[PDB]
Amino acid sequence: EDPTALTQLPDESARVRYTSSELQDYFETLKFPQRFLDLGNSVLKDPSLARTKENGLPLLQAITRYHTCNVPFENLVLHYDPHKIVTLDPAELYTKIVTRRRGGRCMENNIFLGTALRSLGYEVRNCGGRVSRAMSPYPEVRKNQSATYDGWNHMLLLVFLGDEWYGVDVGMGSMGPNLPFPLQDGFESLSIAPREIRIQKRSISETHATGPSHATKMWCYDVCYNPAESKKTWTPVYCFTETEFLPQDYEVMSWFTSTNPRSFFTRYITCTKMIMDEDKEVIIGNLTLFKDTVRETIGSDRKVVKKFETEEERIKGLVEIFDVNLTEEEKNSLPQEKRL
Amino acid sequence: EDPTALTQLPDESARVRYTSSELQDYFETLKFPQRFLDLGNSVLKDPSLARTKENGLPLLQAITRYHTCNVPFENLVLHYDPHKIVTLDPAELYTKIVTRRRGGRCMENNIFLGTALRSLGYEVRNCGGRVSRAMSPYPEVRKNQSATYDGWNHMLLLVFLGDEWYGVDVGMGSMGPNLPFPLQDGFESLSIAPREIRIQKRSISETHATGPSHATKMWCYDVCYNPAESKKTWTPVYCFTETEFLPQDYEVMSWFTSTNPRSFFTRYITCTKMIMDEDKEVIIGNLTLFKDTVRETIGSDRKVVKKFETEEERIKGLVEIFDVNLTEEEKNSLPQEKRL
Numbered sequence: 001e002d003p004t005a006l007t008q009l010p011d012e013s014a015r016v017r018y019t020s021s022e023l024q025d026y027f028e029t030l031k032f033p034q035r036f037l038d039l040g041n042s043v044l045k046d047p048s049l050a051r052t053k054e055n056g057l058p059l060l061q062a063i064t065r066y067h068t069c070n071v072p073f074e075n076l077v078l079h080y081d082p083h084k085i086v087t088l089d090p091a092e093l094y095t096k097i098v099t100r101r102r103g104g105r106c107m108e109n110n111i112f113l114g115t116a117l118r119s120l121g122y123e124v125r126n127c128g129g130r131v132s133r134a135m136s137p138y139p140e141v142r143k144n145q146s147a148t149y150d151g152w153n154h155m156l157l158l159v160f161l162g163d164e165w166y167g168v169d170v171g172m173g174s175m176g177p178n179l180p181f182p183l184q185d186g187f188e189s190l191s192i193a194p195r196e197i198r199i200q201k202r203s204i205s206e207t208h209a210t211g212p213s214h215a216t217k218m219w220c221y222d223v224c225y226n227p228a229e230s231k232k233t234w235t236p237v238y239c240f241t242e243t244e245f246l247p248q249d250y251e252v253m254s255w256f257t258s259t260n261p262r263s264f265f266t267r268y269i270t271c272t273k274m275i276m277d278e279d280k281e282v283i284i285g286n287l288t289l290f291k292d293t294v295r296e297t298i299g300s301d302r303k304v305v306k307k308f309e310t311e312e313e314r315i316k317g318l319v320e321i322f323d324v325n326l327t328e329e330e331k332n333s334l335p336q337e338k339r340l
Numbered sequence: 341e342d343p344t345a346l347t348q349l350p351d352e353s354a355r356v357r358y359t360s361s362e363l364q365d366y367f368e369t370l371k372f373p374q375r376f377l378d379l380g381n382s383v384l385k386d387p388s389l390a391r392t393k394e395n396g397l398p399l400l401q402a403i404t405r406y407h408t409c410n411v412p413f414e415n416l417v418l419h420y421d422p423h424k425i426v427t428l429d430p431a432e433l434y435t436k437i438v439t440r441r442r443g444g445r446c447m448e449n450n451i452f453l454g455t456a457l458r459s460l461g462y463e464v465r466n467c468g469g470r471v472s473r474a475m476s477p478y479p480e481v482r483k484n485q486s487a488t489y490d491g492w493n494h495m496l497l498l499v500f501l502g503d504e505w506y507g508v509d510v511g512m513g514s515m516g517p518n519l520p521f522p523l524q525d526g527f528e529s530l531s532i533a534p535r536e537i538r539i540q541k542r543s544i545s546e547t548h549a550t551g552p553s554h555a556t557k558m559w560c561y562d563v564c565y566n567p568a569e570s571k572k573t574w575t576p577v578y579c580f581t582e583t584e585f586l587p588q589d590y591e592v593m594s595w596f597t598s599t600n601p602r603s604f605f606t607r608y609i610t611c612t613k614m615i616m617d618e619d620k621e622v623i624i625g626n627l628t629l630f631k632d633t634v635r636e637t638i639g640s641d642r643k644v645v646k647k648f649e650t651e652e653e654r655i656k657g658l659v660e661i662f663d664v665n666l667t668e669e670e671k672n673s674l675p676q677e678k679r680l
Binding site: 002003004005006007008009012114118123124125126130133136137138140141144145148149150151152153160206207208209210214216241242243244246248249250251252253255256259260262264267 | 458484550554556593607
């Protein structure tokens, strides 16, 4: 039958807002220690703190750090699922991430996080971007096309603190900036040592502009994996604009990455949690399952944790290593050609 | 197998250019009269004329007017086609529109036109937009969601003439501006009497902004079907930004509109050409096939031309009314559920 309603951004009075109690349950899923529970509760009691740099940025730093370490970046809904459809509904996302302790990709993570932050009192714009082909898992695409970008396929947040916007992104696993960054041309920071991140406003290589008089510029997020090299090499990760993206834009973007056969997410299973040094309040590495193999990276050192031999091993490994729990129907929904 | 190359914008030296003879063949497909053949030839001989408003705009006006009257806005590639996939390759588009005298939707039309205009010497930026739900063929969507917009799904061009960008769009059938329009906030013009068009820079209804200090603005294209009313009603048609879109962005957008089962293009056959008063150099109406019925509207008056009874009737009508010629494989590719 013809649709009678299409996806939209609800009017302000109709939008999902996570309650104080649901946000507390999210702080517990994040496994906040006492000092950050206390920080979160002070904002719960005074949302005006979420508008300032001095009181809003520290809780924002803590939320983003524990989120990428405890909420998995995963595509299992396209594999271990009977329907293989992505929901971006903020209430269903809450259940998936807080109650079920599952995760997802950039749109599921950052739609949820945007809803949580606005519910805490933050001013949050949903934005859109393009992942660099330098991040492609296809080797010839990395080699020949690293200056190009995908079609719109990434989500990040801009959060307004005091007098400045900050980029916020908890939905890109170990490729992400993994820090709230000031939206500042030329900002650089250590992020997951030895890696550095950089933000620049610049034209991208792909353009029909015949000269600078007609060029446009994007915000470009790059990383330097090894800043100790004599000549720093910056690897592009994604580019984005400040345009407000809508739920139905993400629906278009997610449809492509979830159903176009050239999206690697339709082809291979992947699941990532970042690794924290809690006392030093920094991320130091990541655990990543790709296809059949779990690897732990700490700084520049990478080692294999497990190469799964069977479906049973991979399923138990998702529980024990990632706290990713599947229903019976989800386990049995994996297509036969993808099983171990 | 894993992709070895993804869609990208080619480097300037590898981009498709239409030759002077290919552009001449396009002018004949447009059915230019002699005065516009003369005007086109003068730009083929002196490409610097395409850089000025005084010499570039007249040819631009004539190209866009004859294009929407003579190149069909159609979706038959999703229906009367064995493979039902959309190519955005500018060489294949050339063969489709100039040689085969077929058409397409917004991205096929405007990728082609951008390639042609850049080949004539114009400075052109590919841009992206969202169609208003006020244009939805779904009655309940129109009634309840007219203030909202689709996810990114429209392409238009910005053409820089002299010191001023112009909006150019030959890819929306009867809903389009059907005129090059100056990218000026508040521009209004008659376009297809009695309809008026309007361009405004303004925020759209859907926003997470809690107030105007954090709000964003879009270029918004609205129409007034009946400016004679005591109180003018403006109907939203699409919104866009100046961001340069890439071929791979359009690939994402077209993938949704061509494969998501809530896109109306996946459901119903549609084909439109505009109707010109050639001597008065204005568009006055349109011919539109929708599902099984052809209607002619001239201004505000609409009448049924034909309600097709059989497949043979619809196919002959496409030839006779729209000069849309199908191959035997294309005719026989229509799913049985869609036949008459």
